[PDB]
Amino acid sequence: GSRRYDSRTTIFSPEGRLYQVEYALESISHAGTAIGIMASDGIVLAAERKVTSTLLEQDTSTEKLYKLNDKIAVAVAGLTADAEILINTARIHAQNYLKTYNEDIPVEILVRRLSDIKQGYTQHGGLRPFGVSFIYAGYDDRYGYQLYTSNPSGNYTGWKAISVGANTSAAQTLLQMDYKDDMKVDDAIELALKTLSKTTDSSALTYDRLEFATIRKGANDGEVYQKIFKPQEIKDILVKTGIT
């Protein structure tokens, strides 16, 4: 029958590894680098677009950075189509929690549920896993500013500064070197860009090949604001730090 053609996506290797999860991670390692840095007064999300063409419409584009709700955003690394399936699920889950409790969803709860969905695909159903790694950047009134990551295994962990996608080894070393706990947002913005500028496979880092975002308490009195940077705003911040 059909048994002949089954790849058996949810099995263990002799060594005790999940073949498909490992191969999904190998896919993600070729995706454009995405960096998250958490400061005391905000969070930075930076991401490199995958080999941009000059005729690509840059201003009305969204490849890497997505908004889950008013307080939480994600940076994507891997298959965009896969990520959008998961993002819409995450957006719905956030609204269900708000509808139920009349309170914005705590960041970890949203991250856990999305990670649980990925886990399911590795244990049952006989389908391929989602070839996606997220960096979650969000805020709630319990833990404040938080950075998480999840990968196709469905395993998630919390971070002060983290990278996903390509050249994470090199990127994580540079972040580990220059990061410190009493850091500000404006400093974290500079660190994020400097790290991408050195780890990039491109010749020079430019505004058209980047997506950028911040989550500050820079709004008026005790409230959080999400800023998805415009092309011109990235151009200005790139000159201001002295990269171009």
Partner: peptide, 17 residues
Amino acid sequence: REDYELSPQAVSSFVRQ
């Protein structure tokens, strides 16, 4: 699950639903 107590407002909203 959360090692955290839910607010009275949140509990009441859950109950209402």
